[PDB]
Design a protein around this ligand. Sequence first.
Ligand SMILES: Cc1ncc(COP(=O)(O)O)c(/C=N/[C@H]2C[C@@H](C(=O)O)CC2=O)c1O
Ligand SMILES: Cc1ncc(COP(=O)(O)O)c(/C=N/[C@H]2C[C@@H](C(=O)O)CC2=O)c1O
Lengths: 402, 402
Amino acid sequence: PTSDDIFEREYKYGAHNYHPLPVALERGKGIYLWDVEGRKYFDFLSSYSAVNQGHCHPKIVNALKSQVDKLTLTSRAFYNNVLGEYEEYITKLFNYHKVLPMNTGVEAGETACKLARKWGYTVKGIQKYKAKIVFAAGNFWGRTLSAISSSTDPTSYDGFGPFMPGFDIIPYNDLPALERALQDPNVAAFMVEPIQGEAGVVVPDPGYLMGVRELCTRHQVLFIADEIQTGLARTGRWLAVDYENVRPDIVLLGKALSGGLYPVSAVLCDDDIMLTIKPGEHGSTYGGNPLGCRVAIAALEVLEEENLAENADKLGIILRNELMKLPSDVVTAVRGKGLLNAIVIKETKDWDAWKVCLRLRDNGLLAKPTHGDIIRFAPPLVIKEDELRESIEIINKTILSF
Amino acid sequence: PTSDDIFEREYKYGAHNYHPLPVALERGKGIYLWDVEGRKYFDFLSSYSAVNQGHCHPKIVNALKSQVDKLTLTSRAFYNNVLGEYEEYITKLFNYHKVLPMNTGVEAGETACKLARKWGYTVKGIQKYKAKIVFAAGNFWGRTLSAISSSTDPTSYDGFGPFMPGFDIIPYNDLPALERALQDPNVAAFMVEPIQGEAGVVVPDPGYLMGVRELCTRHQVLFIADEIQTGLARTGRWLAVDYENVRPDIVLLGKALSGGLYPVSAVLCDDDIMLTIKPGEHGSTYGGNPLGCRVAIAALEVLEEENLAENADKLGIILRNELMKLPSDVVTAVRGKGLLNAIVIKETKDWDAWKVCLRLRDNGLLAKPTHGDIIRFAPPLVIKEDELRESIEIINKTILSF
Ligand SMILES: Cc1ncc(COP(=O)(O)O)c(/C=N/[C@H]2C[C@@H](C(=O)O)CC2=O)c1O
Ligand SMILES: Cc1ncc(COP(=O)(O)O)c(/C=N/[C@H]2C[C@@H](C(=O)O)CC2=O)c1O
């Protein structure tokens, strides 16, 4: 049951919606992954921050194992005993009054859009159905029809039927564009990533988040912060927005929310927003099921108890400094916060990000290329400094091998 | 930590998007649920068919426990060893060439809509972006903006911003309406439930599915069968559509696909449809992760090995006959297939479905009301005949108590 057999089998029986890096994992623990040949790799993607806590963290594993013997899903037609414990926990952790639980990140984004529209019509007073939601170019929040209706990436939306109206797009990291867009009284919300992940770890300028908060407040517009990738210690704070002491109106969480053990996502906001959705008006079969809730409690507890945000801050400083010591001839840019980082290489035709990642794979490190000139470096947050310096030397060997 | 404490806690810290039946479960096993007071109930909802295999089925539990120690999520940037095994398994089980794995049922529906639109533009030749998808009134396939854009239930779509264009609605169980709708050359697909679940277990007339298949083929329109609730033995066949030997172009699976242990959904179709989506054009973080795949393999195996479809067929015949022995003065209708059934009561003001379900709860049986006059009866498929007859007597006691 080799790696090539796995590639071929998936090519035969599975959709071709991905072209993954040709490596076939079968075990994961902490910062490490093992393929079916027994080869060991540093994971420098962390499943897009879903395993911030490392792969198969034993406390989250134990929470899942303990709960799976009791009860896993009643549906929301009845109550289960776990959901409320988790809701109190996560709301008090992030100091929002309420949470709406969902499963995937895009379901959290859709929930946020529905909340913004319902609030805009029933509270702000926009006429049905004139509500607009503003997004930043380069945004990524999933693959539903709506989500790709706000994309600026043609691969996401081209050929996928007519698009959700009411979505306007402005440049990222651009306060004057936001002010100009918010002159429109029918804007109900602005949704933005504090750091754009899929776009290539694009870090906006100091003050951007503060200005977004001020503009949204001034024009009674909801500030939706998509922290599904940037949150939960990955950038060195509980929320990337904490770097500028900014309180969004809606915060979206996911991925690391379960440590990779279960699709859990969360929409956090206060009553004046959350309660515009009445009973029967929104939900999900698996949303708030007790199994996901137990593992999400454990995953948040791991993040707090092992102080992973402080570790991500320190080791990210180290990582970026070392990466900046790479030649300007070859690495065009280094950027990121905490342990969410990326490099931009000087792509030729002899040489692109895909080849760099193939060779990183050869040398024991797994990283994702994002367009042909960007490579993300994002190891799990439980990585130690010596493991990080070994990985950095793998990166150096690989980059200078060309 | 009583039941009222649980209600109050969720009301304080959680969104109010549900009004559940006031019962607080903490354990589930097979056909039974236990609340925090230790009271025992028959589950006659089965989490909308997600626990067809019963709550916490030990083989699915063991699959989850075995896999969670190995690897739970690499993301689709790399390969994992499990996904292909599951894809071969489920494609050979349902005799479709390929499966696209997702997490929730609505993600499967959105994937199906995107496939229909991409196929309609790139294969059928519809001009961008004129593709239409036809739905039946009473349809339910989730809570995204798109999904509610095709709803006829005002509680689903009212107040939720402008709607996805390209979605047309025709009456359910209505072959002439489908023929008239399919005169439009720009229709790419018709999506329909073989039995409408959320609408109140509406069973279309014999021959409806056959006529839908013939019409879709005649007008080169894709037949999307939503079997997320009706599939996986709940109606007495592997697929409800098997009752009429009908092969849809796209089949949607979910819920029971994991036995309730993990959000797993599947989109099944052949190459000429599936491969219109190219690498990079669709996906999901958790879609096809190895943990969900292991439990989905185990859940399908449980359905086959315990012959749960045959059991559902036999016990559903028994259930409907006994329910039809209830007074016409009180039970207006009985309907369903296999163990997906519902009754319609003669609602007054002294008396509605909500009160009937409160009293069923009092007498040890948990059922969901769906509008105020419909109550679903849908126990897990591992129920035995004697347990079923005890439950039927609970139903009789309750209905005749009024
Ligand atoms: C900031 C943000 N918001 C929402 C979502 C959606 O969450 P999801 O619906 O996947 O669970 C994501 C998801 N990012 C991912 C997932 C992935 C793939 O789709 O393969 C590649 C990628 O960049 C996100 O980064
Ligand atoms: C036929 C069919 N297709 C797709 C979906 C969506 O799957 P999902 O996104 O929830 O996982 C469902 C979901 N039915 C449910 C879920 C539920 C609630 O939303 O509370 C009440 C209800 O009737 C379905 O019955």
